[PDB]
Every structure is written in structure tokens, then in C-alpha cells.
Amino acid sequence: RDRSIREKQSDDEVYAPGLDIESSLKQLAERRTDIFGVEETAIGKKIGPEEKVTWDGHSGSMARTQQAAQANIT
Amino acid sequence: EESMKWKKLTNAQRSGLNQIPNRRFTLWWSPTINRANVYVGFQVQLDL
Amino acid sequence: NEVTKERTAQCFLRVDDESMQRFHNRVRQILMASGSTTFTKIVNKWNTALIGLMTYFREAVVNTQELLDLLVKCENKIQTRIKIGLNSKMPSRFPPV
Amino acid sequence: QPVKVRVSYQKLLKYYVLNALKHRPPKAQKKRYLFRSFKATKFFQSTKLDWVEVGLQVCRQGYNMLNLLIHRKNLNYLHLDYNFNLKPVKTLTTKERKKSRFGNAFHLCREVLRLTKLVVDSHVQYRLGNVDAFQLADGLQYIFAHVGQLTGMYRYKYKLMRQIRMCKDLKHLIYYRFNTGPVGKGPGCGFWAAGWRVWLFFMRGITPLLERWLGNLLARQFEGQRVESHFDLELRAAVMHDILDMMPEGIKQNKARTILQHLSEAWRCWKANIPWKVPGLPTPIENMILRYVKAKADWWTNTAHYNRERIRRGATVDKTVCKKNLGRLTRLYLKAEQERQHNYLKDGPYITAEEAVAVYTTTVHWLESRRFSPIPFPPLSYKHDTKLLILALERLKEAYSVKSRLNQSQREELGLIEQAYDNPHEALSRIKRHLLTQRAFKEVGIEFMDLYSHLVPVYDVEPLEKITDAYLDQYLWYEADKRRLFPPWIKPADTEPPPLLVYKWCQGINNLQDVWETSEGEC
Amino acid sequence: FLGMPAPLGYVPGLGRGATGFTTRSDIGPARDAKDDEEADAIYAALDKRMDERRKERREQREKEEIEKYRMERPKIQQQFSDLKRKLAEVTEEEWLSIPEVGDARNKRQRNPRYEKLTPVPDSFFAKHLQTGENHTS
Amino acid sequence: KKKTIVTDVFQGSMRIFTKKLPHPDLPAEEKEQLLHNDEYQETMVESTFMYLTLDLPTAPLYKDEKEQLIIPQVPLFNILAKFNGITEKEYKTYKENFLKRFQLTKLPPYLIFCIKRFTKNNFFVEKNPTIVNFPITNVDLREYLSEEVQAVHKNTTYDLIANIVHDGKPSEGSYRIHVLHHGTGKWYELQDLQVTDILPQMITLSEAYIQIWKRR
Amino acid sequence: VLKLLENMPMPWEQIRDVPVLYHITGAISFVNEIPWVIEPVYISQWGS
Amino acid sequence: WDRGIPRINTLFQKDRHTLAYDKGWRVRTDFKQYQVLKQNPFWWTHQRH
Amino acid sequence: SYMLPHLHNGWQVDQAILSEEDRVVVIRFGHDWDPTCMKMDEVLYSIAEKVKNFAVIYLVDITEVPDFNKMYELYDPCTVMFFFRNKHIMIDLGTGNNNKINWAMEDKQEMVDIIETVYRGARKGRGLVVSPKDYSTKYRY
RNA sequence: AGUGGGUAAGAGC
């Protein structure tokens, strides 16, 4: 019984809690208007300034990405 | 290979093990399958 | 005839369409069930199917040209599956040996 | 005229008729003009230049654009010359060769720019004075007739071969008109209008592909078996969403997985055709799940009866698809069988008393007329009580004559067979006891072999009953052959293979007295 | 950790020692070693103006086709709208009362013991070899 | 002509209370204000019906716990529970749901009921096998008329005269018909050349499709 | 690509001064002319 | 030796005595498809018989 | 899809990759509304609990988390990435792109085999593992 | 006709 309760407490939440599932369904519904909503837009459109810079995986551009992120500060 | 036909293996392990006779078959026919004429294109030498 | 002992009738034979469909289905299920399977097992299954068909339907293949086409097509299918198993690229001048 | 020119004639006619027949009226358009908003934008300037100059400028600009596209990831080992031939600068590594792969669109663009380079270079050569105007026209005609040989751009779009086969045809249309009289066969024709317009009409349609491909490729930010798994998952999501919208999730967030588990359990219960009733489930929730299950069941049935018919037609299908479809078809057939058995039990036997009496009386008359003795129960002192058991055991054992591996069921069956073989008298005693007393039996499994045309049932019976049934079958058949219960017309017999049956049928048809007679109208 | 915002001035591509890859050159933006961003807007406006030749016509046609298709096949959420509205009458206590789903099958089916495999008995080979022998008479 | 023979034999007057329904995924205050906006309010529409369409209830879709695989049976009054103000019918139109509730006004001298089978689902067309239990001798329809129009009517008792049954799947089915002989009171079931005398007891034991009733 | 190929000079011409719409940075150059020809004259020229 | 349809080799088979009591073997072979999960290419003939 | 955990920013993805010391991290890069992504989501959710011992499943929306799209070539409709001890693991699937699983696999057994082979190879310190089943051909017949 | 489906992983210098 002790090892059973210890392995029970050793489990990790494989699935997200209720809030996360509800939010994920809301996000999917906002995109899949062919299943939800009233207005039928295309498959992946929500309807009906700052552009993030992303590293390209090259060590040469590591410094450039770092200084871009530094300039991204508030 | 014969001793591993039953040692409580997983699906991936046994599936990979089932291809050993294929490896022996390819090796037995190497001077013919591994020929320039049958497989046209660039040839690559092994490391060693 | 058993009395006149003459050639009163001529019997033309043909392989039934259902039998050809069954043979094609057998070859198809041999090939599609070969993701993880030795080449020798595939060749043995094909050989068994071929001897069964040819021994059962001998004298009936010759008049069924569709059966000849299906047979050579299925044999090419088996060879292509084996060649893909060897290397993931079609040989250009593969030998039959 | 030769065969080739004739086939060129029919091919040109075929293309012309296809163009004429598939003609459609132009769609209403708002008349937005290219090259007119360019001068409106403060980026383009207008001038007038010699055509050869513009051709050279465009060739240089296209080379520069292609070179810029080549050096996209700072991979400077793919040299592109000024004749638009791309080659590695050295023996590039296999990693580099994989890393230096360009799509068919890029090579189509490269070869089309090579063709324009050839045209402009011919014009430049004429302007320099190396070739006369007649030679320039002949060279242009040879370019427009031998694009496949000169460029080979069909390698990246095979539909382009449709143009090439046309252009060659036009050549055969022209030469045998050009070289008809005292002029002999030779490279003197220069009537290049036909090939030129054919290639232009290819260009007017190939332009959008390259334009959009390069616009996406040169943009700052790059952009880039579903029939069955389209309705099901979404349906579940939809239902789930609805519930979580009306579930007071701020108070009952923990019940989302409970709801999904209820949905899965209801779907499983319907699939297993077993009663399903959650007692504490609210009535509106139960209605929700019932409607979801009905929709999913309709989709499931339609998908099964669509995939099965696709497979029957010979369509190319995967392996897991066949297994899933076979499972669905087995479940559907077993539901139909459950309904059929229930209907038979509820409505009683379909065979009426009088029809049964007629059948039984016919059988009695046949048996009496044949002086048939009913098969006795296997006696305790039967002379052949052992041979039949040995044959039954051999037939049962032939199921594993090739099976290299055996699971628990197979090894238990083999153990029972061997135990019955070691003590034949005990096995026979058990067989007799089961025949005399056993009336209730264990559950027999059912599976279905898929022949892609029909689903053959295969039945799994317990080995203990299997041995008894095998011995019973052997004994019954031995008796039925001892006393001729089965008249000769019953087939197949133990004397003729089915091909011999066909041959015997043909020979019997032929051997009937005057069977091939039609003088008096007999048929 | 879930539910936590990113630190300011942190490159997710960095901070892990990760290194990307390039399967080919056709995919991904060109690797890079205010009169610039004002040209992209002009080019985009140019493209939109040119795409406006039949844009309204074909979008109206697409809308009509979508409505015709949905005439007989409603949206999935539409098919459940009535039941969804009826779900509003359920009280919070009735929500509390939904029971956890249980699995009927017992241990021997949920988590069966390993189905060991055994070689064919030698009696099979003995029978196969004994068969095929021919009487001399 | 306003009153042809078919009109005076089969046509009757019936009343529909059509109420527009807002989108169910709307805030409660917004739904209430839309309802007060006089657009989603009840409207009365009179109409003439040659027949009454009877919507069979949903199948159980699951085996009965006690006596497994029981064919559903519904009393005729539950189907007749339509055409009154107490019961609504949320029509799930693909555009938006409608809250339409019916109400009979003037019963025809002869009544035609059509039990809705062969309903096309989202993927194909299936036939509802639910059986309706009705008193063949007589039925009462005075309870399904509004108080304003019950003064005019004096004969609301209806007796079954004709019954139509569909046997088999929608793909391939057989249309059998029972008819009541006025002279003898006997029920005769005829299918193609076949004609047989059927007891009235098992008339309701079939997939009734079209019913013809006489007010007498 | 299409513009210069459809505006390419005919075999009876030497120099074809065509209008050009060129990018201010020399990126691209369009032959901003549609090759209009009077068809009887064009066919007669080609017969010549 | 290998000419007759009931091949002469069956006369000299080892189990030629116990096979004589095996009757209706063609029908059993044909019906075997309903018991074994694998289709038999030789559903029509028996090598022993 | 919605059942599996979701990561909202690139830092959370980094933390998820770093925090796993003895389990292979399987991340599905794509959009929850994509049908191919839906197949990956349903397969992963089906086997999210079976392989809990030696794996973990995270879902990342590349629209809300584009931070890897340049570096990981996250432009296919749905991609699958395997990591072990903060090290991306390659799989010789036979398709010519060992970096990721860019296509939808119908069979959950195949994905379980892939995950187990990845765990076995990466535990031994290797960086590329040979897939148990070849995928240069869909075996359709 | 044709591109591919042909990247060994690892250690720091």
C-alpha cells in the first residue's frame, strides 16, 4: 500500500487541466469556423507595428539576435 | 537470432529483428546489387 | 463421343473473372502486408499462390490473356517491392539472377 | 508523304480541336492593367531602348536574380554561369548535396531564362555580323523547334512536353511544305513564327506559377489520407466545446475529462452494441451524448460502406486502412446478425409447418427408397474407433504444421491433442460422454478474412469440443461413404478434383444421345 | 513551467544551445548576413490592386456556393444548437453529480500478462520426416 | 375555384406560432434585448394543410437494459401532442434556429396523416422504424383545438379508414396497404396482386406511413 | 521574360526602338509594348 | 510413377492404410477456410490423398 | 489536441525541453485546427498515457510561437520533434528528412515504436536513431 | 522524361 500510494503520488499530469482544455477548444473554435460560429471564413482565419525576430539557428547570427532581443526591451 | 525469437521483446524490437535475413540476403548478392549499372548516380565510399 | 469415338464437340476453357479477382486480391494482400516481412517470405507466398493458380487453372490460362497480363503485372509488383526493400530507389538495369 | 508528317497533322488537329471545344467565355473583369500602376508608383521609369539592349539587360537581370536565389542560405558552392547552367563548384559532400536541392520551379525558371538568353544571343550574333539575317531566322526556328534538345526544361514540368511535341509537329508541317520543289532537304528554313507563338502561349500560362513562387520565396517571411479522419474528431471537439461553454467551468473545470470519458464510453458501448445508461448523468447531457453518438454512427457507417466499396474496385489503399475497415465491417455485420437473430426469435421460425412436413416427407421417401440404414451411435467396441480418432487428430494438428511460434491457445490445443493421442481410450470415452450429455458449450469466437470482395467468417472453437467435433465428422463421413447416403451427383467427391469435375461435366454433356441436334427445334 | 511568461530580452532559439538545420534551400526565408519597409507596403498594395480584378466577383461566387452547400449540410455546432441551449437548464448540483467513467473489463483484460511464445514440438518434424517414406510394395 | 373537391375532402386550417430565436451563443442581456426588439417575437400565421406531417421521436439507439433489443413504440397521443400551444418544436435550420409551435384551427372532414420516414441524416438517408400505437376504433381530436374554434366544430371523432405501411429499407421497400370496407367493417390488406383479409387487431403492428381517417 | 519574347523584332527589321519600363535601381526591365500588327499586312510580309 | 491423377505414389504411401478410412476429405479441405485464418491455395486437392 | 498540454511562448518550450532529464520530449509543431495536426493530436493523445514512463507530449502552436520556424524549418502543416536531454534527436525514417516527422501517421503502434526506438537510441548517447519501419513508401496497394 | 525518397552520430580544437 505504501509503494502504491508513493507511485500514485509519483505520477505527472499527462493531460492539461479543465481551464486549459476549455481555452484550447475556444481557440480551435475561433479558427475552425466550418464547425463553429455563424460566419464561414476559410480554414484558418479568425475574421468571420512589432514583428518578432527569430534566430535562424546559425552561430554567426547569435550576436545579432542577442542585440535585437536587447533592443526589444521595454 | 534464433535465441531472440522469444525473449519477451517489444513490437519495435521484434520488427527490427525480423529484417536480419534480409541483411544476409543483400550481403550475399552484393557484387550484383551494389553495381554502378543497376543503380546509376553518384557513388559514395564508406568511411574506412 | 463414347460411341462414335469422334470429335463431336470442342470445349474452350477460360479462367473465371471471380478467380482472377481472388488471385489479384491475394497478391495485393501479400504485398500490402509486407512492411516488416522478409523477402523470402514474400517470394514463398507469391510462389505458393502462383502454383495453386497455375495447377488448378492449367489449360485455362492460355485463353485468358487478361490472366497473363495480371500474372506478369503481379510478378512485376513483387519484384518492385523486393527492389524497394533492398534500396529506396528503383534500379535501372536490375538483373533477374 | 511519310507517316511522321501525317501523325503531325492529326496531332495538330487534335490540339486545335481540344482548344476549340474546351473554350470558355472570358470572365467579367474590372480592367486592372499591369505596367500602368508601375509608372504610377515612384519606383519605375519610362524610356525607349533598342530591343536587343533590353534583351541583354533582362538576361543580365535574370542571371542576377537566379544567382541571388542560389546564394540564399550563404551556400556559395553552386556556380551558375551566364548561359544559365547550374553546376557544383567542386565535389560537394552528400550533406551539401542534400542541402543544395532546388525545386522544379527554380529549374523551370532557370531553363526558361536560358531559352530567352539563347534568343537574345542569336539576335546579338546577327547584330555583330557573324550570321546573316537568313542564318538568324534559321537559328531562331531551330531554337523554337529544338527547345527540348537545347534546354530540356521538360525535366521539371512534363506537361511542357505538350508544347514540344506540338513544335516538332509544326516543323514537320513546315519543312515538307518548305522543301517541296527544287529545294532539297536541308537546314535552310527560317519560318519561326509558329514555334515562337506556341512558346509565348506557354509563357502566358506559366508566368503566374513562377511569379507567385518567387514572390513567396523572396518574401521576408516564408509561408507553407484525411477523408476518414475529418468528421469524427471535429464532431467530438464540437460537442465537447458546447458542454464546456454551458458547464460553469469556473466552478466545474475538473469535469472536462469526465465529459470526454463519458463520450468515449458511449461511443464504445454503441460500437459494442451493448446497453448504455449512465444513471447520474443529466438528461440534457444524455441527449447531447446521444445525438453526438448518432451523428458519429452515421459517419462511421458511411465511411465503412465507402472504403469497402473503394477497396472492392481495386483502388490503392494502405494497410492500416484495410484493418480499420475490416474491424468496422465486422462490427456492422455482427450488429446486423444480432438484429437478425432477435427478429427470428421474436417472430418465430420462418419455415411453416406444411412446408416442413413436405420437406421431411420428401426426405423420408428418399431414404426409404434407397434402403438407407440410420447411422448408429459409435459403439464401445467399434472396430474403427481408433483410425477415426487418429485421422481427426491429424486433421486438427495440420493447423500448426508450419507455425514456427505458438501462443498459449495453440500450445494448449497441441497438449490436448497429444494427451488424447497418448490415451486413445480416455479420449473416446470423453467423446462419447460429450455426445450423450453435453448440450451447452463455451463461447466460440468469430473473425473475418478480408478477400476485398467478401468477408469470409472464421470460427474459433475450444480444443476440447474441437476434438469431439473432428471425430464426429470423421465417423459421420466414413459411415456416409460406407452406406451411400450421398448420391453420385453430390460434389465434390473423393475421386475427382474440381477440374476433373468440369471435364466430366463437359464429357457427359457431349455424350448424351444426339445432344447437338437442332433440325427439329430441340434445345 | 506552464503559466509563466518569458523573461525580457531572451531568445528562445538561444538559451538552450540548440542548432537548426536546412533540409533544402527552397524552404525558409533567405538567410541574412526607413526607405526599406515603405517599399514592401507599396508592393503589397500593388499586388492587392492587381488581384482586385475579379476579387469581389469570385468572393461573391464563393459565398453563394458556401451557402448552397450549407443549405443541406448545416454546421456541426448548428446541429447541436438546440441541445446546447437545453443544456442551460442544468443546475450546478446536477453538474456535480456526473460520475467518473469506469472500465468494466477486469485485470486479466486491462493489463494481461505477457503472452509467451514457444517453439514447435519436435514431434512435428518427426511426423513430417516419417511421412514421405514409401513402402517398397 | 376556392373550394374544389380535394379542398373540401382533405384541406384543413391550421395555425403556426413562429418565433425567431437569437443565436444561442449570445449574452443573456443581449438575448433579452433582442427579444424585446420585436424581431424575435411570436407571430401567428394561418395556413391550409392537405395533410399533417407526424415527426417520429428519436430512436433509443441503445439496447434496453431489461429486455434487450426492443422495438420502440409510441402512443398516438404523443405524436398528436404537436399542433398545440403547450408544445414547441425547435427547428434547427442551417442559418438559425426557429421556435415554431403549431395549433389546429379547422379540422377537415377527412384527415390525412403522413408519418415522416426516410429522413436524410448528415451522410445518407435512413428509415425510422418506430411504431405508433393508436386506437383503430376511434380517436379524439377535440383536445387539440383552440378554445376559439371549438364552438364551430361538433364532430372531432375520427376512425381509421386507410393505412399505408413501408416494409424494408429505403433503398428497396414494399408498400402494403390496409383498407377498411365500409359495408362489412373488415380490414383488407392488399400488396400487388396479393389480397388478404387482415384482422384489425394487428393493424397497428406495422410501420404505418400514411393514415386516412374519417370524421363520420 | 514574356515581354521581350513577344516583342522580339521581326526578320525584316534591324533595330526596334521599343518602350521600356525599368526599375529605378535597375532590378527589372519590361518591354511596355503589345505587338500590334495589321493582320493582312503581317500575313503578306510573312509570305514575302 | 507420377502420371495417374490419384498419383501412383499414393499406393506406396506410408500411411496408405489409415488414409483409406478418411472419407469426404475434399469437402473438409474446402470448408477448412471457415476454421483457419489463412486462405489455402490448394483448397481443392490433398497431397496425401 | 485540446487534451494535451499546450505551450504558449518559446521560453515555455525551452523550459519543457530542459526540465526533462530521463524522458524523451515529443513536441508537435503545427496548428490545432489543421486536419493533419488533428491526426497527430489524436494519435498522440491515444498514446499519451501508454508511453508516459519514457516520454512526454507537448503541443506548440507555431503561429503563437513562431520562434523556431526559421531554425527548425517549421513550415510543414504538421511536424514532430524528439528531444532528449536538451538535444534534438534525428530519425532515419527513410523519407530523406531525418530531422522531423512532417507527415501524419495513422497507426498509433507505429508512433509508439518510433518513440521507443528514439528513447533507446538517445539513451545510449546516440543522436540519430534508425526507425523500426521504413517510410520511403506508404505501402499502399 | 525527371527531381529527390543517398545527411552516420560523437569529442573538443
UniProtKB/Swiss-Prot annotation, chain A:
Ubiquitously expressed. Residues 47-55 have a biased composition (Basic and acidic residues). The modification Phosphoserine is found at S10, S61. Residues 62-71 have a biased composition (Polar residues). The modification Phosphotyrosine is found at Y15. Residues 47-71 are annotated as: Disordered. There is a cross-link at K52 (Glycyl lysine isopeptide (Lys-Gly) (interchain with G-Cter in SUMO2)). Signal peptide: none annotated. It is found in: Nucleus; Nucleus speckle. SURP motif 2 mediates direct binding to SF3A3. Component of the 17S U2 SnRNP complex, a ribonucleoprotein complex that contains small nuclear RNA (snRNA) U2 and a number of specific proteins. Part of the SF3A subcomplex of the 17S U2 SnRNP complex which is composed of three subunits; SF3A3/SAP61, SF3A2/SAP62 and SF3A1/SAP114. SF3A associates with the splicing factor SF3B and a 12S RNA unit to form the mature 17S U2 small nuclear ribonucleoprotein complex (17S U2 snRNP). SF3A1 functions as a scaffold that interacts directly with both SF3A2 and SF3A3. Identified in the spliceosome 'E' complex, a precursor of the spliceosome 'A' complex. Component of the 17S U2 SnRNP complex of the spliceosome, a large ribonucleoprotein complex that removes introns from transcribed pre-mRNAs. The 17S U2 SnRNP complex (1) directly participates in early spliceosome assembly and (2) mediates recognition of the intron branch site during pre-mRNA splicing by promoting the selection of the pre-mRNA branch-site adenosine, the nucleophile for the first step of splicing. This is Splicing factor 3A subunit 1.
Swiss-Prot record, chain C:
It comes from the Eukaryota. It is found in: Nucleus; Nucleus speckle. Widely expressed. It is linked to Retinitis pigmentosa 13: A retinal dystrophy belonging to the group of pigmentary retinopathies. Retinitis pigmentosa is characterized by retinal pigment deposits visible on fundus examination and primary loss of rod photoreceptor cells followed by secondary loss of cone photoreceptors. Patients typically have night vision blindness and loss of midperipheral visual field. As their condition progresses, they lose their far peripheral visual field and eventually central vision as well. The MPN (JAB/Mov34) domain mediates interaction with TSSC4 and SNRNP200. Has structural similarity with deubiquitinating enzymes, but lacks the residues that would bind the catalytic metal ion. Contains a region with structural similarity to reverse transcriptase, presenting the classical thumb, fingers and palm architecture, but lacks enzyme activity, since the essential metal-binding residues are not conserved. This is Pre-mRNA-processing-splicing factor 8. It comes from Homo sapiens. The chain holds residues 1218 to 1314 of 2335 of the full protein.
From Swiss-Prot, chain E:
Widely expressed. It comes from the Eukaryota. The modification Phosphothreonine is found at T118. It is found in: Nucleus, Nucleoplasm; Nucleus speckle. The modification Phosphoserine is found at S81. Phosphorylated by PRP4K during spliceosome assembly. Involved in pre-mRNA splicing as component of the U4/U6-U5 tri-snRNP complex, one of the building blocks of the spliceosome. Enhances dihydrotestosterone-induced transactivation activity of AR, as well as dexamethasone-induced transactivation activity of NR3C1, but does not affect estrogen-induced transactivation. It is linked to Retinitis pigmentosa 60: A retinal dystrophy belonging to the group of pigmentary retinopathies. Retinitis pigmentosa is characterized by retinal pigment deposits visible on fundus examination and primary loss of rod photoreceptor cells followed by secondary loss of cone photoreceptors. Patients typically have night vision blindness and loss of midperipheral visual field. As their condition progresses, they lose their far peripheral visual field and eventually central vision as well. This is Pre-mRNA-processing factor 6. It comes from Homo sapiens. The gene is PRPF6.
Swiss-Prot record, chain F:
It comes from the Eukaryota. Disulfide bonds: none annotated. Residues 1-216 form the USP domain. It is found in: Nucleus. Belongs to the peptidase C19 family. Deubiquitinating enzyme that plays a role in many cellular processes including cellular antiviral response, epithelial morphogenesis, DNA repair or B-cell development. Plays a role in pre-mRNA splicing as a component of the U4/U6-U5 tri-snRNP, one of the building blocks of the precatalytic spliceosome. Specifically regulates immunoglobulin gene rearrangement in a spliceosome-dependent manner, which involves modulating chromatin interactions at the Igh locus and therefore plays an essential role in B-cell development. The U4/U6-U5 tri-snRNP complex is a building block of the precatalytic spliceosome (spliceosome B complex). Component of the U4/U6-U5 tri-snRNP complex composed of the U4, U6 and U5 snRNAs and at least PRPF3, PRPF4, PRPF6, PRPF8, PRPF31, SNRNP200, TXNL4A, SNRNP40, SNRPB, SNRPD1, SNRPD2, SNRPD3, SNRPE, SNRPF, SNRPG, DDX23, CD2BP2, PPIH, SNU13, EFTUD2, SART1 and USP39, plus LSM2, LSM3, LSM4, LSM5, LSM6, LSM7 and LSM8. This is Ubiquitin carboxyl-terminal hydrolase 39. It comes from Homo sapiens.
